[PDB]
Design a protein around this ligand. Structure first.
Ligand code: CLA
Ligand code: CLA
Ligand code: CLA
Ligand code: CLA
Ligand code: CLA
Ligand code: CLA
Ligand code: CLA
Ligand code: CLA
Ligand SMILES: CCCCCCCCCCCCCCCC(=O)OC[C@H](COP(=O)(O)OC[C@@H](O)CO)OC(=O)CCCCCCCCCCCCCCC
Ligand SMILES: CC1=C(/C=C/C(C)=C/C=C/C(C)=C/C=C\C=C(C)\C=C\C=C(C)\C=C\C2=C(C)C[C@@H](O)CC2(C)C)C(C)(C)CCC1
Ligand code: SF4
Ligand code: SF4
Ligand code: SF4
Lengths: 80, 37, 73, 165, 144, 146, 740
């Protein structure tokens, strides 16, 4: 499975969650940013590694980071 | 002195390059397809 | 299920695609990445691998000498 | 003289090459009437060929066994043996023109940088300013030394971005 | 809100079939089933290729992977303002509800959700790989 | 390639006894293409022809063998995974939909080579053809001429 | 109601936008912040669909852009006619066409380039041209540089008119969408007016000018003493002397006594023995028939009266039991989508350009065109390349429609929908067909190469060893050859000498002779089948999977031109339909490169050659049959042997071809840098270079950026095709001009 991590730099834009095409991320209540919300990655087992979340992340540097890891039928996005 | 017979190539070349490859490929393919207990 | 090859990377051994065969062959000499690798075991594996390389080189030279002495002029 | 080369003026291969070149042009000049425009053109090329072989020899160029002029690039050999118009002088001529272009372009970028939209002045050229800098670029070498001595040519490392390391 | 139960005998949108449908994986590993309610019969695009007519009220479709189900989920929500839900179904009869996990779409912050894979540091505060060397396996300074 | 071309051409001319050819033809690239590559390739490409073959046949066959591998590398180097992955998926459908063929199945799910893998496989094919082509040309040109 | 509908003064004519780069785009009008903006500006300049979602505005931009193209083409033609009147040897070539080489480009004497002014003949020095203009002008009956100069002035007057029309129909009276959506009216005018009237008018020029002038030229009359075209147009007695039937006037036409005009309207076939070209009387009766046929065709669609057909009705009527709804929805797709029209038009227009190359070479329509091998090879290769490019473009715009104009609500259970529903069956079956062709086509060459290298020639596929004769093509050739006596009784001769019969020789050179087809021909025809099938596979796959695939289900949202979907799913590089066009270009280049090489070798080996006493000596001595069955044979007897002309051109007039030959090998290798690399490496290298510019305070405000992934691919393919095609171009022209 690919390793997805969220960093304190997260601003709670929710853009990564909206960009994810496999529902690997969600917004959880937080107190570190003004938006009072931070991105979480509770379903990384369904992550394929498209890195759309990173493309949607506007922080410098990225608050969401994807590290390609062990490959599975879900990770390879195989319908067979 | 350490000289193989004339038939050596007529036998060694067939075995090495055809027979041995087949044997090697067979065992190798089996191991890869085998799954951990 | 988990295949036996490669034994040095459970990750690859749990890959259900043909990529497992290619990566198992491609990452066999990267000892530092092998599962449960320690610095001492890393050195001992390399030491044995170096004896293996030397064995191959001397057989290559013996093979060369033999074919010239047996089929050349 | 140098490197065992020989003056083109005394090379036999240099002379044979000039004859070979003029004989090709002459073999062609025949198929045409004397005043025909083709004939006039082949004659002007033959005159230009004769002048080149003569001008190159007069310039004191050295020729190899191939009978072709070779250029001396060592500043020491060129100055001591009369071969400085081959690489040395050309070097200072180019360096002046190339620095001219660079110093003017740098002066332009610096001037447009203090404007409202520098990017706009790079796609749409401020012609009047560009022409002014183009003319003031003749004294670039002295300006470049004066900037190097005031410490205004370079940027402070603290103001230049770099990767994490 | 409670975890929904998948009714497998739900009517499926009108569609003549295609060649981009389920494969042997659906019978050996797992398949995905999207379900939604339609207030009117509307033609829509099958993520597997082809046009299909959604039926009035309940609708059910089966896809080979989760991405195809979420792709259809995106079109129905963005274009028809519908609210679909999908599940992973195993070959032994087991059904697993997947989205929306808590009934609230992930982009909308919801209570109860506990953060996961979050690092109380910026990426530039990660350690050098030399520190995570000779661990149980190949790992990244980020994983620590 | 440049260093070995230089060495071979300078020695071929010295061995033949006319260093002037290199001295007058090496100063322009047309000279390299015609006086080194084109001229020294005749005997090699005639290793086998409609009139028969000679001891240089293996080198003529290898010379072309290297050109083939070199060009095969271009496919792994220019074409990328996405295109191939979608093609294989169609074949997986064809195998599972083909009667009798669907009876036999694969233990490893067929997938396109990875991005890094493709770069390596392409570079290997490119490098092998590069060496085989020059080795065939070098030995044939020197041996056939001397 | 079909009617003229326009908007008045729609767009103001000012230079305000000229000074605001990127004004047409909502994203680009903001101005540049990085270098990517410059590329984006040029790459998105003619993408009106992306500029605006208004079809009427897009249609008005397309119409005026076409007037701009027509004006460009007119200037190009005026230049060719002007260079023929002021910088050519046409008048001398008219007197001696079998020895004087056509030339219409003279170079200035500078930096020694005057060497390119070769001794073409006729007391002239210039670059030899291979466009075939001299033969076209002779066929048209032009005998003076005054006529070429007058046509040049006319073309510029026409170019000015085209540019005016473009400005007027966009800024003053812009046609409304309803006007453009009158497809029934457009087809009636283009078939009846443009095509039928154009053919009728041309028949007028040929009958009153081309036929008498060329008859006098072929009789040996000096071009100076030939009557001027008007003299023939205003005097019937002269035309009556040359053609007795002209003494009867147009009475026979209206009295249905057409047989009387048999002396100028003929069905001879074959070739004029004097010139080696088709009979102009045959070309005249042909264009007259074409004109009649197209005038009828232009009265088929309904307009403002009840008579005529409705394309929507015809389409909706053609439906069968195996195709669901059938052709329903197509009329709506082909009246609201320009990309759909461009896809079909590019496909047919390219296929046509390829058909022109084959027909013009086998049936040489111009006088003295057949024996001008440089022009013949250039024409065939040029039109073949134009066709191939247009065919690849057809694929791209079909995918653009599938991604941007396709709507499922209008395509349920129709042919389009049913095709997308069995795309995997189509691509998988085509995949196997491609693999079968590859092994059974190129595998045969490998077998022959190995058998020859192993000294086993009897085990090779050849006309002497194992034989693979193209029997079907041999039977068709025999049928077409014997056609004149049975299936085509009126025709005096067969359409072409390629089918068979006696050879026609002009100037001692073979104009055309029968072309034999053996094992080597059978093998190369199957390589063509393989290369075309594979190119179709890539283009078709790119179009059918443009909206979605099993790997990527929302490809349509990503768009037509996108680099990838990330390294996930194993790697999704080059999944966009645009990337399929990128790959298709390489295979189209591979296919056509093989097609033109086949033509050149076959023609130089079995057709072209000097005719001597008792025997024809071909340029390559008929070595195609025994040398084109192995790759080694191709590399040695074609590339290596015929490259001698280009490699030995230095010091002559063909020296330019040698320079271009090297320069083209360079551009091709330079493309590999872009094709094998990635922007990630270049961006970092630029970062260190930018550092040096920052250090010396010479860093630009517009941030330097590596080319986009898609731009990197586009730059690579462009330089690959430019370099590769230019290399063949230099090789072909140097070879043919020298041994022509
Ligand atoms: C790295 C050393 C080396 C290499 C490269 C070769 C290579 C070769 N050997 Mg050889 N051989 C070697 C060592 C080697 N040998 C030694 C040490 C011995 C002593 C036992 C022999 C005894 C031997 C015999 C008796 C024969 C060969 C033959 C051959 C040739 C047949 C190729 C084949 O695959 O069939 C057979 C390959 C082998 C028997 C050796 C395997 C080496 C592979 C390439 C590794 C081949 C070129 C045959 C031959 O001469 O063909 C004309 C043959 O008759 N070899
Ligand atoms: C006299 C004591 C001695 C000797 C002779 C050696 C010898 C060797 N040790 Mg070693 N070692 C020693 C003590 C010694 N060791 C001690 C005390 C320790 C503990 C600190 C170690 C720890 C150690 C380790 C950890 C390793 C070695 C290894 C090696 C081998 C190197 C393999 C190699 O590169 O090929 C031979 C190298 C040479 C012959 C050097 C010459 C190279 C030149 C540049 C070539 C020039 C040749 C000439 C110019 C042209 C030839 C032309 C023609 C003949 C072809 C080598 C045979 C390696 C090994 O195990 O390999 C299996 C390795 O991993 N040793
Ligand atoms: C950049 C590389 C380069 C190289 C490889 C050379 C190489 C050479 N230079 Mg030189 N030179 C260079 C740059 C270079 N130069 C530059 C940039 C200048 C501008 C000042 C000069 C100015 C120069 C002069 C004035 C002379 C040479 C000379 C020479 C030749 C002998 C010089 C020597 O002894 O050692 C090599 C020299 C250098 C590595 C650096 C500069 C040359 C030194 C400073 C000159 C000392 C020469 C000395 C008198 C030895 C020659 C004795 C006698 C024959 C005069 C020699 C082949 C001498 C010569 O042969 O003239 C006929 C000579 O007198 N050069
Ligand atoms: C002096 C006459 C004139 C003036 C002042 C304008 C002014 C304007 N036109 Mg316009 N137009 C004109 C003549 C004129 N036009 C003519 C004769 C035509 C018929 C072709 C058109 C067709 C036309 C269209 C279809 C459109 C405009 C548009 C516009 C507006 C913005 C676009 C623009 O001009 O930017 C400047 C653009 C350029 C300078 C590009 C020049 C294009 C030339 C023809 C290409 C030449 C290429 C060359 C032949 C080959 C290059 C090869 C290479 C190797 C060098 C603008 C106010 C656009 C608009 O309405 O705004 C959205 C619009 O879409 N015009
Ligand atoms: C006899 C009627 C007629 C004729 C001859 C043409 C001819 C042409 N049309 Mg067309 N068209 C017509 C009727 C006609 N049309 C009608 C009734 C409609 C409305 C349904 C259209 C709508 C239409 C569109 C939308 C387009 C064309 C286009 C074209 C050009 C395509 C380029 C080509 O292949 O030819 C080769 C070019 C030549 C042979 C040059 C000669 C052209 C001269 C000017 C002939 C005159 C044509 C013109 C219609 C005559 C009236 C001019 C008058 C108003 C001053 C072509 C010249 C395309 C275009 O953009 O052209 C700019 C295009 O996009 N037409
Ligand atoms: C576009 C095709 C075309 C054109 C333009 C012509 C034109 C011509 N043909 Mg022709 N022809 C053609 C096709 C064509 N042909 C074809 C396809 C065939 C094969 C069947 C023939 C076979 C043929 C034959 C056998 C003959 C001609 C002849 C002629 C000429 C005489 C026509 C005639 O007798 O009266 C035709 C009637 C008219 C043209 C009507 C004229 C109306 C005028 C121009 C209108 C003026 C109005 C204006 C307001 C006046 C004011 C002026 C102003 C200053 C105030 C004529 C120039 C004859 C010839 O060669 O003469 C020597 C002849 O013998 N043709
Ligand atoms: C009637 C023919 C025709 C027409 C009207 C169009 C029209 C269009 N095409 Mg298209 N195309 C065609 C044929 C045609 N095409 C063919 C035959 C091919 C196959 C190669 C393509 C392949 C193609 C692709 C892949 C794409 C388009 C795109 C487009 C759209 C935007 C064009 C653009 O990007 O602007 C800008 C145009 C340029 C910047 C020109 C680039 C310069 C050229 C390519 C260099 C060629 C070499 C040149 C001759 C070298 C000169 C010498 C040199 C030393 C200077 C546009 C509506 C784009 C699109 O649809 O957007 C999504 C797109 O991606 N076309
Ligand atoms: C010389 C280089 C080369 C070669 C050989 C090929 C070959 C092939 N390409 Mg390809 N391609 C290339 C370059 C090349 N390409 C480049 C540079 C690009 C970038 C544009 C592409 C892009 C490309 C695309 C996009 C596609 C292909 C496809 C194909 C396959 C078409 C189907 C087929 O013919 O199967 C038959 C196989 C052959 C004809 C190869 C012949 C090999 C010989 C005859 C067999 C000998 C076997 C031997 C005896 C085995 C024993 C060896 C021993 C050691 C045991 C084919 C194998 C298509 C595909 O995937 O297949 C449908 C496809 O879509 N290519
Ligand atoms: C040629 C195909 C004949 C078949 C044919 O054209 O018959 C036409 C057949 C009959 O159509 P209908 O009469 O039902 O309706 C046709 C209407 O669309 C109007 O023509 O349509 C099909 O079902 C095509 C079958 C798919 C094709 C299956 C294999 C395709 C062959 C691939 C290439 C082979 C070479
Ligand atoms: C002022 C100017 C600019 C230049 C800016 C800067 C900082 C340029 C940097 C220059 C630096 C750091 C040079 C550092 C070392 C240079 C060295 C050691 C010089 C080497 C030259 C040698 C050895 C001479 C070789 C020869 C001579 C005598 C001349 C010829 O005969 C040829 C040859 C090789 C024999 C800007 C902004 C690019 C814009 C523009 C105008
Ligand atoms: S890489 Fe793709 S699947 Fe994974 S979390 Fe990011 S957007 Fe989601
Ligand atoms: S895109 Fe980045 S900043 Fe925005 S919610 Fe996701 S991780 Fe946080
Ligand atoms: S290598 Fe380039 S094209 Fe391929 S997935 Fe990565 S970024 Fe996309």
């Amino acid at each position: 499975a690919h390793i997805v991590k969220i960093y304190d730099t997260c601003i709670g834009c929710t853009q990564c969650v909206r960009a994810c095409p496999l529902d690997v991320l969600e917004m959880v209540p937080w107190d570190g940013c003004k938006a009072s919300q931070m991105a979480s990655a509770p379903r990384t087992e369904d992550c394929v590694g498209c890195k759309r979340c990173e493309t949607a992340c506007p922080t410098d540097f990225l608050s969401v980071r994807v590290y390609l890891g062990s490959e599975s039928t879900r990770s390879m996005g195989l319908s067979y | 002195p350490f000289v193989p017979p004339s038939w050596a190539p007529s036998v060694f070349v067939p075995l090495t390059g055809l027979v041995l490859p087949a044997i090697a490929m067979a065992t190798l393919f089996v191991y890869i397809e085998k799954e951990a207990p | 299920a988990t295949k036996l090859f490669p034994k040095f990377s459970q990750g690859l051994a749990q890959d259900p695609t043909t990529r497992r065969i290619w990566y198992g062959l491609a990452m066999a000499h990267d000892f530092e990445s092998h599962d449960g690798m320690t610095e001492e075991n890393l050195y001992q594996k390399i030491f044995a691998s170096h004896f293996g390389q030397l064995s191959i080189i001397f057989l290559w030279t013996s093979g060369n000498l033999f074919h010239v002495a047996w089929q050349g002029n | 003289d140098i490197a065992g080369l020989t003056p083109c003026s005394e090379s036999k291969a240099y002379a044979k090459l000039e004859k070979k070149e003029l004989k090709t042009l002459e073999k062609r000049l025949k198929q045409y009437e004397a005043d025909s425009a083709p004939a006039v053109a082949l004659k002007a090329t033959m005159e230009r060929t004769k002048a080149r072989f003569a001008n190159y020899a007069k310039a004191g160029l050295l020729c190899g066994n191939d009978g072709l002029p070779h250029l001396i690039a060592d500043p020491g050999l060129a100055l001591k043996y009369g071969h400085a118009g081959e690489v040395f002088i050309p070097t200072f001529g180019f360096l002046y023109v190339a620095g001219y272009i660079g110093y003017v372009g740098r002066q332009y970028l610096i001037a447009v940088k203090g404007e409202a939209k520098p990017t706009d002045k790079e796609i749409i050229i401020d012609v009047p300013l560009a022409t002014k800098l183009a003319w003031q670029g003749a004294g670039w070498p002295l300006a470049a030394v004066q900037e190097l001595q005031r410490g205004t040519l370079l940027e402070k490392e603290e103001n230049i971005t770099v990767s994490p390391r | 809100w409670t975890v929904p139960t998948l009714n497998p005998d739900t009517p499926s949108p009108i569609f003549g079939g295609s060649t981009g449908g389920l494969l042997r994986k659906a019978q050996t590993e797992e398949f995905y089933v999207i379900t939604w309610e339609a207030k009117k019969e509307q033609i829509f695009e099958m993520p597997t290729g082809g046009a299909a007519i959604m039926r009035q009220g309940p609708n059910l479709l089966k896809f080979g992977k989760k991405e195809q189900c979420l792709a259809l989920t995106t079109q129905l929500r963005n274009k028809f303002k519908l609210t679909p839900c999908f599940y992973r179904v195993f070959p032994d009869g087991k059904v697993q509800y997947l989205h929306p996990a808590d009934g609230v779409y992930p982009e909308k912050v919801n209570a109860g959700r506990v953060g996961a894979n979050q690092n109380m540091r910026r990426i530039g505060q990660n350690v050098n790989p030399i520190k995570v060397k000779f661990s149980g396996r190949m790992m990244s300074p980020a994983e620590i | 390639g440049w260093v070995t071309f230089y060495w071979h051409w300078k020695h071929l001319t010295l061995w033949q006894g006319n260093v002037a050819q290199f001295d007058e033809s090496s100063t322009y690239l047309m000279g390299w293409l015609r006086d080194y590559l084109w001229l020294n390739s005749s005997q090699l490409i005639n290793g086998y022809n409609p009139f028969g073959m000679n001891s240089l046949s293996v080198w003529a066959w290898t010379f072309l063998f290297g050109h083939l591998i070199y060009a095969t590398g271009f496919m792994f180097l220019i074409s990328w995974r996405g295109y191939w992955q979608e093609l294989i998926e169609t074949l997986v459908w064809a195998h599972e939909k083909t009667p009798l063929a669907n009876l036999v199945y694969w233990k490893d799910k067929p997938v396109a080579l990875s991005i890094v893998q493709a770069r390596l496989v392409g570079l290997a094919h490119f490098s092998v053809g590069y060496i085989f082509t020059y080795a065939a040309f070098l030995i044939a040109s020197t041996s056939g001429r001397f | 109601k079909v009617k003229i509908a326009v908007d008045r003064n729609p767009v103001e004519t000012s230079f305000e936008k000229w000074a605001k780069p990127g004004h047409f785009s909502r994203t680009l009008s903001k101005g540049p912040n990085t270098t990517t903006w410059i590329w984006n500006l040029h790459a998105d300049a003619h993408d009106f669909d992306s500029h605006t979602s208004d079809l009427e505005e897009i249609s008005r931009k397309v119409f005026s852009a076409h007037f701009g193209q027509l004006g460009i083409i007119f200037i190009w033609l005026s230049g060719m006619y002007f260079h023929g009147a002021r910088f050519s040897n046409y008048e001398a070539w008219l007197s001696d066409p079998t020895h004087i080489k056509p030339s219409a480009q003279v170079v200035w004497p500078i930096v020694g380039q005057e060497i390119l002014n070769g001794d073409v003949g006729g007391g002239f020095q210039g670059i030899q041209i291979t466009s075939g203009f001299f033969q076209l002008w002779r066929a048209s009956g032009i005998t003076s540089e005054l006529q070429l100069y007058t046509t040049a002035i006319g073309g510029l007057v026409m170019a000015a008119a085209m540019f005016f029309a473009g400005w007027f129909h966009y800024h003053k009276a812009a046609p409304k969408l309803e006007w453009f959506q009158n497809v029934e009216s457009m087809l009636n005018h283009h078939l009846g007016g443009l095509l039928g009237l154009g053919s009728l008018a041309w028949a007028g020029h040929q009958i009153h000018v081309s036929l008498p002038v060329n008859k006098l030229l072929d009789a040996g009359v000096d071009p100076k003493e030939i009557p001027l075209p008007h003299d023939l147009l205003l005097n019937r007695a002269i035309m009556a002397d040359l053609y007795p039937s002209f003494a009867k006037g147009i009475a026979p036409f209206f009295t249905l006594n057409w047989s009387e005009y048999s002396d100028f309207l003929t069905f001879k076939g074959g070739l004029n023995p004097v010139t080696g070209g088709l009979w102009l009387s045959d070309t005249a009766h042909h264009h007259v028939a074409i004109a009649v046929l197209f005038l009828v065709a232009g009265h088929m669609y309904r307009t403002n009266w009840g008579i005529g057909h409705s394309m929507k009705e015809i389409l909706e009527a053609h439906r069968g039991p195996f195709t669901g709804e059938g052709h329903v929805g197509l009329y709506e797709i082909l009246t609201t989508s320009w990309h759909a029209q461009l896809a079909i038009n590019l496909a047919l227009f390219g296929s046509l350009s390829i058909i022109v190359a084959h027909h013009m070479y086998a049936m040489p329509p111009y006088p003295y065109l057949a024996t001008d091998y440089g022009t013949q090879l250039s024409l065939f290769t040029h039109h073949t390349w134009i066709g191939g490019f247009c065919i690849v473009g057809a694929g791209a715009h079909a995918a653009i429609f599938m991604v941007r104009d396709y709507d499922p609500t209008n395509n349920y259970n129709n042919l389009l929908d049913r095709v997308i529903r069995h795309r995997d069956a189509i691509i998988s079956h085509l995949n196997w067909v491609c693999i079968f062709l590859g092994f059974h086509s190129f595998g045969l060459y490998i077998h022959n190469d190995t058998m020859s290298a192993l000294g086993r020639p009897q085990d090779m596929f050849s006309d002497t060893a194992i034989q693979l004769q193209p029997v079907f093509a041999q039977w068709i050739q025999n049928t077409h050859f014997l056609a004149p006596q049975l299936t085509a009784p009126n025709a005096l001769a067969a359409t072409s000498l390629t089918w068979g019969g006696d050879l026609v020789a002009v100037g001692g050179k073979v104009a055309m002779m029968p072309i034999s087809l053996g094992t080597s021909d059978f093998m190369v025809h199957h390589i063509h089948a393989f290369t075309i099938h594979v190119t179709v596979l890539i283009l078709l796959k790119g179009v059918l999977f443009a909206r979605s695939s099993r790997l990527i289900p929302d490809k349509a949202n990503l768009g037509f031109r996108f680099p990838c979907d990330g390294p996930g799913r194993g790697g999704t590089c080059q999944v966009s339909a645009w990337d399929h066009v990128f790959l298709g270009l390489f295979w189209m280049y591979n296919s056509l490169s093989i097609v033109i090489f086949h033509f050149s070798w076959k023609m130089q080996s079995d057709v072209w050659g000097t005719v001597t006493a008792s025997g024809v000596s071909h340029i390559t001595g008929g070595n195609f049959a025994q040398s084109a069955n192995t790759i080694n044979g191709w590399l040695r007897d074609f590339l290596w042997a015929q490259s001698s002309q280009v490699i030995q051109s230095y010091g002559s007039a063909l020296s330019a071809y040698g320079l271009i030959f090297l320069g083209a090998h360079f551009v091709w290798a330079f493309s590999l840098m872009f094709l094998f690399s990635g922007r990630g490496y270049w961006q970092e290298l630029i970062e260190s270079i930018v550092w040096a510019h920052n250090k010396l305070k010479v860093a630009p405000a517009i941030q330097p950026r590596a080319l986009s992934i898609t731009q990197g691919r586009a730059v690579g393919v462009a330089h690959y095709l430019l370099g590769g095609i230019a290399t063949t171009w230099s090789f072909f022209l140097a070879r043919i001009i020298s041994v022509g």
